[PDB]
Swiss-Prot record:
GO terms for molecular function: ADP binding; ATP binding; enzyme activator activity; kinase activity; protein kinase activity. A motif (KxGQ motif) lies at residues 19-22. One of its GO terms (biological process) is ubiquinone biosynthetic process. It is a single-pass membrane protein. Homodimer; homodimerizes via its transmembrane region. Interacts with the multi-subunit COQ enzyme complex, composed of at least COQ3, COQ4, COQ5, COQ6, COQ7 and COQ9. The gene is COQ8A. This is Atypical kinase COQ8A, mitochondrial. The keyword Transmembrane helix applies.
Amino acid sequence: ANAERIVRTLCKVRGAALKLGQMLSIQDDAFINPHLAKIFERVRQSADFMPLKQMMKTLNNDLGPNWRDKLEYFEERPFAAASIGQVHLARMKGGREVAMKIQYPGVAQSINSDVNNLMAVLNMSNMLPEGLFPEHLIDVLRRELALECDYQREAACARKFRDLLKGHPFFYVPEIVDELCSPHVLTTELVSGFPLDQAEGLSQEIRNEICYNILVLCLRELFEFHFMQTDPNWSNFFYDPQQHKVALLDFGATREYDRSFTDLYIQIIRAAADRDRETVRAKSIEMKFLTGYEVKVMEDAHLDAILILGEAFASDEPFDFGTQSTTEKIHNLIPVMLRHRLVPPPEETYSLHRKMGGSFLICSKLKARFPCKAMFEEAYSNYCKRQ
């Protein structure tokens, strides 16, 4: 199918498209259709082409006439995309550099029809990964897209993560600039660097270190903070090669999980690291990752992927995230819950199912290789003590 035609149609529903991209890990790795990955890159960069006066509508509606009055400089071309918004560089009256993430107008009101239209385009493209059927994507995307609209809550999540990561040697969260925040605008101090989804050209040793730190953060989110971002937006993680630090800009749809969920989940990962397939299966059915009735090949998609996670966490040798077989297994975990079930599971169960795999997949994209047993034993030990 013709790429720029698809790009043009996806741009009309860019919020829905990019959010779905985050949820499905649509990226240039060993598994995704390369034409599809390139199309999604084009949609991201096409924030450049989105109407001027749409931005100023949102700024008008949210902090009225006079906002410009706060600024020495407002860059009219965004420097990044963030699904239902785009991020602009500004300089406040005073010189302070900021990053203003501005929502497209009326996204909350066009969610159902936008998700509808997105699935039409993706269905006709014939580029969707195997096992993903549009009708099974609709509901989960509509719900997650509505959550992304809540920039007041995203600001609150950013504040909490900044507190959690205070003093961290690698990660940092820029300060929220309250005077430039509203329901539809989220402003932080500026960050600089490689977006991580563009970091493939860095040295092996630097990619290894970035990704080791990313997977550790994932484990801490799951088992220490109990506060986690489901589908992160790696294009809004910024590596500064000068400081050797990664800035975290996007906290959309961050979730708290109770002890009951996290208890059972860590038992599943422990079982996988102990190479206990039957216990992974049983506890997966308890969790409702599986209903227990899946056809054998789909059951196996789930079990083979979780056991690959366990393989990494059980090995004192470096794990090679970038192999095509590992990349494929982790992607093929995603369709397991995306089917019509007799009993719809809790929304948060869907999100938890995708979380660890998403982190493995940015490691795959960046062709990282590093040992994982120590991070898991640390995380597990730490969790068990508080038990």
